Ligand binder design. Structure first.
Ligand SMILES: *[C@H]1O[C@H](CO)[C@@H](O[C@H]2O[C@H](CO)[C@@H](O[C@H]3O[C@H](CO)[C@@H](O[C@H]4O[C@H](CO)[C@@H](O[C@H]5O[C@H](CO)[C@@H](O[C@H]6O[C@H](CO)[C@@H](O)[C@H](O)[C@H]6O)[C@H](O)[C@H]5O)[C@H](O)[C@H]4O)[C@H](O)[C@H]3O)[C@H](O)[C@H]2O)[C@H](O)[C@H]1O
Ligand SMILES: *[C@H]1O[C@H](CO)[C@@H](O[C@H]2O[C@H](CO)[C@@H](O[C@H]3O[C@H](CO)[C@@H](O[C@H]4O[C@H](CO)[C@@H](O[C@H]5O[C@H](CO)[C@@H](O[C@H]6O[C@H](CO)[C@@H](O)[C@H](O)[C@H]6O)[C@H](O)[C@H]5O)[C@H](O)[C@H]4O)[C@H](O)[C@H]3O)[C@H](O)[C@H]2O)[C@H](O)[C@H]1O
Ligand SMILES: O=c1ccn([C@@H]2O[C@H](COP(=O)(O)OP(=O)(O)O)[C@@H](O)[C@H]2O)c(=O)[nH]1
Ligand SMILES: O=c1ccn([C@@H]2O[C@H](COP(=O)(O)OP(=O)(O)O)[C@@H](O)[C@H]2O)c(=O)[nH]1
Ligand SMILES: [Mn+2]
Ligand SMILES: [Mn+2]
Lengths: 263, 263
């Protein structure tokens, strides 16, 4: 645990870095005994790298990997997600025997160190197509073999969604049909889309939520937050505002724990 | 071939009966060798019951069971779905050893008799909360024991969503974590919402779809269809129109196979 296992996140810029900082802070809040690592690319400013170094045990600099797959990315109206191929570098971290990758738009609500009981590749179902796993939280084993296989697949075939999730689902294609232990409970990767879409289920199961995932184009750091009243401005049709306490928690952690580190 | 196995659907009115008729027509189109059964309630007109007897091998009259659960039904803005507890009568059908229940708003695209290789309770994940199964397609074993247990649970505790899906998930609570063979592939219950929500997945996995499920308040029979050009009128934000060929298939089956028996 102490030395050989890690939580790993990714940021390619200073905007998603705010997410990584909140994520990291939340993992510390719930007393993880594992290492905290962030993959960062050159667009992350030197000053932001130094702040990341105050929350994460290590900031590892990597090259951007970009699908350039405009056709598939436009299908999802997420033209900016080609750089998510950069996530594949997480397999290069052979200093660790086992890691949990978490998207920089996640937030931890409870200690989730029991994820290290799982084996590669363990992930939660994606609400959009639930025979695919969501690649925002997953348990994997760093490996030079797997790393290079994934790079090769990405170069030769690309990804069916132009980002990491398509290629990871294609590589780890047995997930839907083999080994139910590699299905993480949905409470380890609770997309705000699910709360909005089937509120009765959230009402009975949502109290057990361990990780919330602010999946979608609008991210927590794109809201206007008032720390005096603890509210955000919001617009119509916003699944983040079905149970807005997760978004306010994000902002509370940012305002109280991250904002002083930005001084 | 199995004279002791059946597909089973439900209609409490003449509107959903149009759905049942198209479903049963589609099961015949794809050469099922099993029996076709429809549970119908007193609000189904006598003329419609007679038409149902042309498609279905058995039309079984049952009493409406209604949750009356306005609080939970309004959370999903589906105030009409309390009558879905009537589905529980499917477990009374002890003349069959095994059955597949299918919602009246489903449509079969390929032979699915291989579902009878599955054991109770086998179902596909729900896109809204994917640690719940969707109760629109499920493999079950009729049983007086199970029937009465479900009725009793429904009377004492009700359903967390006011309809059958909540209570069925509560009763068959091991589904998410036990026996991956009881996870039907999502292609056996493909919700239109999923096509709309993660189109790249539909583009690579969707050609294999076996069953489409027109889940949501607007049903196929509510569209205005022009048989001359094979088109429907549609409004903004319609997940059914992402891949509208499923809706058009519904209408082509209705127009050619079913409408002439009604009008
Ligand atoms: C829909 O059509 C209109 C939009 O075209 C819509 O109007 C909307 O306007 C708002 C947009 O500004 C919208 O906010 C919503 O934002 C999300 C849309 O971005 C929406 O969630 C939906 O869209 C997401 C995509 O962002 C779908 O996720 C799917 O695709 C993701 C990648 O694009 C997957 O992420 C995964 O893959 C990454 C890349 O490989 C990987 O790096 C990640 O780690 C991994 O998570 C995801 O898995 C996959 O499912 C959602 O499925 C889909 O629900 C939110 O609901 C919402 O916040 C408003 O909702 C809306 O008003 C109009 O209303 C609709 O008819
Ligand atoms: C959201 O806010 C606005 C909604 O008011 C929305 O504006 C919309 O207006 C249109 C409405 O005409 C909308 O069309 C929509 O149609 C679908 C629903 O009507 C919607 O899908 C969403 O809603 C359904 C609810 O019907 C969710 O399903 C969940 O709940 C179901 C039961 O209610 C579950 O069904 C299951 O359970 C039954 C009862 O127990 C059982 O009998 C069944 O057999 C079984 O299937 C289901 O499993 C569960 O998931 C969906 O999850 C959810 O996606 C479409 O997305 C939507 O298109 C227009 O799109 C929109 O303009 C506004 O845009 C949004 O921000
Ligand atoms: O410009 C970007 C886009 C994405 N990411 C990283 O890739 C992940 C996946 O992207 P995102 O969460 O936006 O996808 P979603 O979950 O919304 O589909 C993020 O959480 C970040 O870790 C990044 O660093 N920079
Ligand atoms: O007024 C109704 C409502 C529902 N149903 C039956 O219950 C199923 C579940 O309801 P629906 O499909 O509308 O729910 P959804 O799948 O849209 O959540 C239907 O397919 C029908 O078989 C019915 O017979 N009459
Ligand atoms: Mn994300
Ligand atoms: Mn249905």
């Amino acid at each position: 645990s102490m030395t050989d296992q890690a939580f790993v996140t990714l940021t390619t810029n200073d905007a998603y870095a705010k997410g990584a900082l909140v994520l990291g802070s939340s993992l510390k809040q719930h007393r993880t005994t594992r290492r905290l690592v962030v993959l960062a690319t050159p667009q992350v400013s030197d000053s932001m790298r130094k702040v990341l170094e105050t929350v994460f045990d290590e900031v590892i600099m990597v090259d951007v990997l970009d699908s350039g797959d405009s056709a598939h990315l436009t299908l999802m109206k997420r033209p900016e997600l080609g750089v998510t191929l950069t996530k594949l570098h997480c397999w290069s971290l052979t200093q660790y025997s086992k890691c949990v990758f978490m998207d920089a738009d996640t937030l931890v609500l409870a200690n989730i160190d029991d994820l290290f009981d799982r084996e590669e590749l363990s992930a939660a179902p994606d609400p959009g197509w639930p025979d695919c796993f969501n690649s925002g939280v997953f348990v994997y084993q760093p490996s030079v073999e797997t790393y290079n296989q994934l790079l090769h697949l990405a170069s030769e075939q690309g990804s069916f969604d132009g980002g990491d999730q398509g290629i990871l689902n294609t590589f780890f294609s047995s997930w839907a049909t083999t080994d139910i232990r590699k299905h993480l409970p949905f409470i380890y990767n609770l997309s705000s889309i699910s709360i909005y879409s089937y509120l009765p289920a959230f009402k009975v199961f949502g109290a057990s939520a361990k990780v919330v995932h602010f999946l979608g184009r609008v991210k927590p750091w794109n809201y206007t937050y008032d720390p005096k009243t603890k509210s955000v401005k919001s617009e119509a049709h916003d699944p983040n505002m079905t149970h807005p306490e997760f978004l306010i928690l994000w902002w509370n952690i940012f305002t109280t724990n991250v904002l002083p580190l930005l001084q």
